[PDB]
C-alpha cells in the first residue's frame with residue numbers, strides 16, 4: 001500500500017503489466033486445456049436405467 | 051486428428067504465417083433402427099457376418115455393412131460358420147442361402 | 157450456470173442397432189500457426205544507441 | 206500479499222458430467238458418437254467389432270463372452286483396489 005514505492009516502481013516502466021499479462025495468459029490457458037481435454041462432445045449422453 | 055467424422059482426405063492452404071487444412075470427412079446421417087443378432091442359427095450351425103452385421107426390419111433378416119444400410123440376403127458367401135448354436139447368447143433362427151444349391155439341383 | 161450440452165439419451169437395448177442410411181460429406185477448417193516474425197535486436201544499439 | 210487463486214471455469218461436477226457423457230456414449234454407441242450421431246449397438250456386438258479391429262474373429266468374443274465379461278469386471282475391480290492400496 002506504499003504510494004512512494006509505487007511511484008518509484010513506475011520508473012521501471014511496464015514490467016508489472018508484462019507479468020500480469022503473462023499470468024493472465026497462463027490462467028486462461030488452463031481453462032482452454034480443460035475444454036480441449038473434456039469438452040469434446042456437445043451432447044450429454046446418459047446410460048439406460050437397466 | 052483430421053477433422054470431425056471419418057476422415058476421407060484433406061487439402062492444404064497457405065495462410066500468413068500459417069496453414070489451413072480443409073478436412074473432408076464422411077459423416078453418417080439418417081440412421082434407422084433395426085433388430086440385431088450376434089449370429090444366425092441354421093442347420094445346427096452358428097453363422098457370423100464376414101464383414102457386416104445382421105439386421106432385421108421386423109420380419110426378415112439381412113446382412114449389411116456396418117457404416118451404411120445396404121441389406122443383402124444372408125448367404126454362405128458373406129457369413130462364416132464357427133460352432134453350433136448352443137454357445138452364442140442371443141442367436142436367432144433364420145435360413146442361410148446357398149448359392150451352389152440351385153446349381154446341382156438343375 | 158453454463159449448460160454443458162443438450163441431453164441425449166441413446167436408446168440402448170440388447171438387440172437393437174442403428175444403421176445409417178445416408179451420409180454427409182463435411183469439410184471443416186483447421187488453422188495452425190507455423191512461423192513467427194523473424195526479429196533481430198542489436199543489444200549494443202538497443203541499450204546504448 | 207497480492208496473490209489470488211482464480212477458480213477454474215469448469216467445476217469438478219461438470220468435468221465429472223463430461224466424463225459421464227463420454228462413458229455413456231462409448232458404452233451405448235461405441236465409437237459412432239465421436240464421428241457423428243450416436244448409433245446404438247449392443248455392447249457385446251461393440252466388443253466383437255473391437256475384436257475385429259485387433260484382428261480377432263467375432264466368434265471368439267461371442268463364444269467366450271461370459272469369460273470376457275468376468276475378466277473385464279475383475280480387471281476393473283483390480284484397478285480400484287490398486288488405486289486404493291497404492292499411495
Ligand SMILES: *[C@@H]1O[C@H](CO)[C@@H](O[C@@H]2O[C@H](CO)[C@@H](O)[C@H](O)[C@H]2NC(C)=O)[C@H](O)[C@H]1NC(C)=O
Pocket residue numbers: 107108109110
Ligand atoms: C423387410 O424387407 C423385406 C425385403 O424387402 C420386405 O419383403 C418384401 O416386401 C414387399 C412389400 O410388402 C413385397 O412386395 C416383396 O415381395 C417382399 N419380399 C420378400 C422377399 O418377401 C418386407 O416386407 C420388409 N418388412 C417390413 C416390416 O418392412
Ligand SMILES: *[C@@H]1O[C@H](CO)[C@@H](O[C@@H]2O[C@H](CO)[C@@H](O)[C@H](O)[C@H]2NC(C)=O)[C@H](O)[C@H]1NC(C)=O
Pocket residue numbers: 091143
Ligand atoms: C431354433 O431352432 C432350434 C432347432 O430347430 C429349436 O430347438 C428346438 O426347440 C424345441 C422346442 O423348444 C425342442 O422340442 C427341440 O428339441 C429343440 N431342438 C434342438 C435341436 O435344440 C429352438 O427352439 C428354435 N428357437 C426359436 C426361438 O424358435
Ligand SMILES: *[C@@H]1O[C@H](CO)[C@@H](O[C@@H]2O[C@H](CO)[C@@H](O)[C@H](O)[C@H]2NC(C)=O)[C@H](O)[C@H]1NC(C)=O
Pocket residue numbers: 081082083165166167168174
Ligand atoms: C429407435 O427407437 C427408439 C425407441 O423406440 C427411439 O427413441 C425414442 O425417440 C423418441 C423421439 O425423440 C423419444 O421421445 C423417446 O423418448 C425415445 N425413447 C428412448 C427409449 O430413447 C429412437 O428415436 C429410434 N431411432 C430412430 C433413428 O428413429
Ligand SMILES: *[C@@H]1O[C@H](CO)[C@@H](O[C@@H]2O[C@H](CO)[C@@H](O)[C@H](O)[C@H]2NC(C)=O)[C@H](O)[C@H]1NC(C)=O
Pocket residue numbers: 080177178179180
Ligand atoms: C441422402 O441425402 C441427400 C442429401 O444429403 C439427399 O439428396 C436430396 O434429396 C432431396 C429429395 O430427394 C432433394 O430435394 C435435395 O436437393 C437433395 N440434396 C442433394 C444435395 O442432392 C438424398 O435424397 C438422400 N437419400 C436417401 C436415400 O435418403
Ligand SMILES: *[C@@H]1O[C@H](CO)[C@@H](O)[C@H](O)[C@H]1NC(C)=O
Pocket residue numbers: 139140170171
Ligand atoms: C435381451 O433382453 C430381454 C429383456 O429385456 C431378454 O428377454 C433377452 O433374453 C435378452 N437377450 C440377450 C441376448 O441378453
